Write a protein that binds this ligand. Structure first.
Ligand SMILES: O=C(O)c1ccnc(C(=O)O)c1
Ligand code: NI
Ligand SMILES: [Zn+2]
Length: 350
């Protein structure tokens, strides 16, 4: 509880030697208290690239682009998705850069941020979100989102189950004012986000240790949603402005991600944000030993079929054998300490 006492978003510039073992570097950033913010930025070494170029992708199909209709006022919004017809990246980029949807002119990011919160209910944009794929070359051995080699691999290993976007990669083609609503990951997992190219993506984050304060507040503002689902934030429809969070005393931080940067999110780290203009991001979830307890305790959406539920059985039997029978008989009373680094970080703590 002494590392990163302010729970602020940290940034890391590893060398190529530090960069190589993905799981070990996550254990390192946690030894530095990065997980306390819920969100960390890792800027990869200059010589690292995941792809020779992106010249060849115009013909790539976005099967289900989503028009984002936002309704609300005074810092509180609900985002509704309108599924559009499939389109090629070529088609998507022409719409993104057209006068009707392009990024407005601005000086500071604080200026663009005001325009985002002022305008998010007007001129609904299109997000090429949740596209099954990867833009990593097959030989890329470091921080390859298609194969991170974390203990999350036990899901597919033990059961054969693949969960799209969770243990497989997703691409996201943004335009100006496209959004991701406030959410934690499925099963309160970690996630990795790489911005392959284009305009920036801005992020807000609430520290895991304060996640419950955010839920209590969301539940107050959206009482119908709360009555009808145990975890409605997981619908990823709820936008809440940082001025509202400030007004109700929720600690949050912000950060802008540029092309070529990774963002890590941590178990129970609520995050939200928006794209600045035409870009492309890739992400997936992953786990460390610390996640197992979060997985066991995650409150899952109780109202949608096709919602992600992972069996924790394999993880408890393997990594917590002494609590297995207790947990099974429904008696495992463990309280999560959000400040604690993952066991794998021992190495870096003397
Ligand atoms: O679309 C995004 O940018 C984004 C960012 C962070 N997280 C998610 C998610 O679906 O968890 C989506
Ligand atoms: Ni996310
Ligand atoms: Zn639900």
């Amino acid at each position: 509880e002494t590392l990163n006492p302010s729970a602020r978003i940290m940034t890391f510039y590893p060398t190529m030697e530090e960069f190589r073992n993905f799981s070990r570097y996550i254990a390192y950033i946690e030894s530095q208290g990065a997980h306390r913010a819920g969100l960390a930025k890792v800027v990869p070494p200059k010589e690292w690239k995941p792809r020779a170029s992106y010249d060849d992708i115009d013909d790539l199909v976005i099967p289900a682009p989503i028009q984002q209709l936002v309704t609300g006022q005074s810092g509180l919004f609900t985002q509704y998705n309108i599924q559009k017809k499939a389109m090629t990246v070529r088609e998507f980029r022409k719409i993104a850069n057209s006068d009707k949807y392009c990024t407005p002119r601005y000086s500071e990011f604080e200026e663009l941020e005001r325009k985002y919160w002022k305008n998010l209910t007007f001129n609904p944009p299109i997000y090429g979100a949740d596209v099954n794929g990867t833009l990593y070359e097959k030989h890329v051995d470091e921080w390859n989102i298609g194969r991170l080699r974390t203990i999350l691999d036990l899901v597919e290993k033990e059961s054969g189950i693949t969960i799209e976007g969770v243990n497989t990669p997703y691409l996201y083609f943004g335009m100006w004012k496209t959004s991701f609503a406030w959410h934690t990951e499925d099963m309160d997992l970690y996630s990795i986000n790489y911005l392959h190219f284009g305009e920036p993506k801005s992020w807000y984050s609430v520290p895991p240790e304060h996640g419950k304060r955010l839920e209590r507040l969301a539940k107050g503002f959206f009482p119908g949603s709360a009555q009808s689902c145990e975890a409605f934030l997981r619908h990823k429809m709820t936008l809440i402005s940082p001025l509202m969070l400030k007004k109700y005393g929720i600690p949050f931080d912000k950060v802008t991600q540029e092309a070529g940067e990774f963002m890590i999110t941590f178990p129970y780290g609520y995050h939200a944000g928006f794209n600045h203009g035409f870009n492309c991001a890739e992400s997936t979830n992953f786990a460390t030993r610390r996640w197992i307890e979060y997985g066991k305790q995650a409150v899952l959406c109780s109202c949608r079929k096709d919602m992600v539920k992972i069996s924790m059985d394999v993880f408890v039997r393997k990594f917590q054998p002494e609590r297995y029978k207790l947990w099974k008989a429904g008696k495992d009373n463990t309280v999560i300490d959000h400040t604690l680094p993952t066991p794998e970080a021992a190495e870096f703590l003397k």
